[PDB]
């Protein structure tokens, strides 16, 4: 893997249910903050949840994130899904300048 971070291009969940996104990265990015971002433009996206560069699980409202720093994967969960949750999201790694980011499109199926 040459990219710093990769994920699923698309992910689907059902209204009122959940979805999970595995943001896989390469070992050099272990000690960096990881985050889950929403919307466009890409680099002014809204951070929904972010780690503190440890393996501590973080949850903010309906979004959770945890960085597995052995396997180098941070997992995002979104729960109690709403149709308005559909759209463009990003796996992100915080660094100086341009953050590594990976575009994830979220689709929501009703009922």
């Amino acid at each position: 893997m040459e990219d710093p971070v990769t994920g699923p291009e698309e992910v689907s969940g059902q209204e009122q249910g959940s979805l999970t996104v595995q943001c896989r990265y390469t070992s050099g990015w272990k000690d960096y903050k990881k985050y889950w971002c929403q919307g466009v433009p890409q680099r002014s996206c809204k951070t929904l949840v972010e780690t503190d560069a440890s393996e501590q699980l973080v949850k903010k409202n309906r979004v959770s994130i945890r960085d597995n720093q052995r396997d180098f994967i941070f997992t995002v969960t979104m729960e109690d899904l709403r149709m308005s949750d559909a759209g463009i999201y990003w796996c992100g790694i915080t660094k100086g300048g341009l953050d590594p980011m990976f575009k994830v499109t979220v689709n929501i199926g009703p009922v």
Partner: protein
């Protein structure tokens, strides 16, 4: 005595986006006291904010560009900003180098590039650059440091060198100041104002080339004065004798007075207007100076 260039607004240059002035209007529904940083000049000729003399500097920047391929992002540019005349940029009492964009969104910029790739050498490359309002790119034009990128499956093999980035398009335009210093405060030209009760800002309008995947509506951007007025005041260095100038905006071929207004010394024009929605004016008139007047001078309504 102060005079003004004899130029119709429609033949003038916009002071915040490099394009003609197309519109002249008041609109009380828009923010009343915008904190624009370009197109800001005192009647005594003092440039304010990041306002340049030359229209060509508007919404542009100059830099020593350094390029690095970043797999999964593309070719990344680190721009070490200079002033657009080539002199060194030094952080000081304004937000950024002269002419640097004073609005937000994601800007496409064009720069000259040079490649080592066999079979070509010079071309123009379009980069994307996030301006603001907040970003995760840690933009710091106040520190002379900004970042841009271009999608590329592999390295473009660019040669580092001096560029002048000019604006191709805006995406997600917001008329709010960009990220000048990685989230920190910077010295700014103050909000435009104050206005007397019932006074509103006169706006010179142009339209910005745009990316928008759903809406075809034009992207308006307003400024307080055409760029020709900026260079006029900067050249003439008039002495101010009161707090404002009474102007008449007139058709010179008809004699028809279209309105009177006040140019406050601080470089913005007010009309007395009580309407709720926009009122546009013809762009083929001429502004003529009538007299010095005090701040409290009361204008005839339009």
């Amino acid at each position: 005595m102060v005079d003004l260039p004899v130029i119709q607004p429609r033949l003038c240059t916009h002071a915040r986006w490099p394009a003609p002035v197309y519109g002249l209007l008041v609109d009380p529904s828009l923010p009343s006291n915008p904190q624009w940083q370009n197109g800001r000049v005192h009647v005594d000729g003092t440039l304010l904010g990041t306002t340049p003399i030359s229209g060509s500097w508007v919404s542009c920047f100059a830099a020593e560009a350094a390029y690095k391929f970043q797999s999964g992002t593309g070719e990344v540019a680190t721009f070490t900003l200079i002033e657009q005349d080539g002199s060194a940029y030094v952080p000081g009492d304004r937000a950024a180098p002269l002419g640097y964009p004073d609005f937000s969104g994601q800007l496409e910029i064009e720069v000259q590039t040079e490649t080592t790739k066999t079979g070509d050498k010079l071309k123009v490359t379009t980069f994307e650059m996030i301006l603001g309002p907040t970003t995760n790119a840690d933009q710091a034009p106040y520190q002379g440091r900004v970042f841009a990128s271009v999608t590329a499956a592999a390295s473009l093999d660019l040669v580092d060198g001096r560029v002048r980035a000019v604006p191709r398009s805006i995406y997600g335009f917001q008329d709010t100041i960009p990220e000048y210093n990685d989230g920190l405060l910077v010295p700014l030209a103050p909000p435009i104002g104050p206005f007397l009760p019932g006074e509103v800002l006169l706006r010179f309008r142009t339209y910005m080339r745009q990316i928008d995947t759903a809406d075809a509506a034009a992207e308006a951007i307003d400024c307080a004065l055409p760029q020709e007025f900026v260079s006029w005041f900067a050249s003439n260095a008039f002495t101010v004798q009161s707090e404002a100038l009474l102007l008449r905006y007139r058709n010179t071929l008809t004699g028809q007075l279209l309105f009177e207004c006040k140019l406050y010394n601080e470089g913005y024009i007010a009309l007395s207007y009580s309407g709720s929605g926009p009122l546009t004016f013809p762009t083929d008139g001429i502004f003529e100076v009538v007299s010095w007047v005090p701040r409290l001078y009361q204008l005839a309504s339009v």
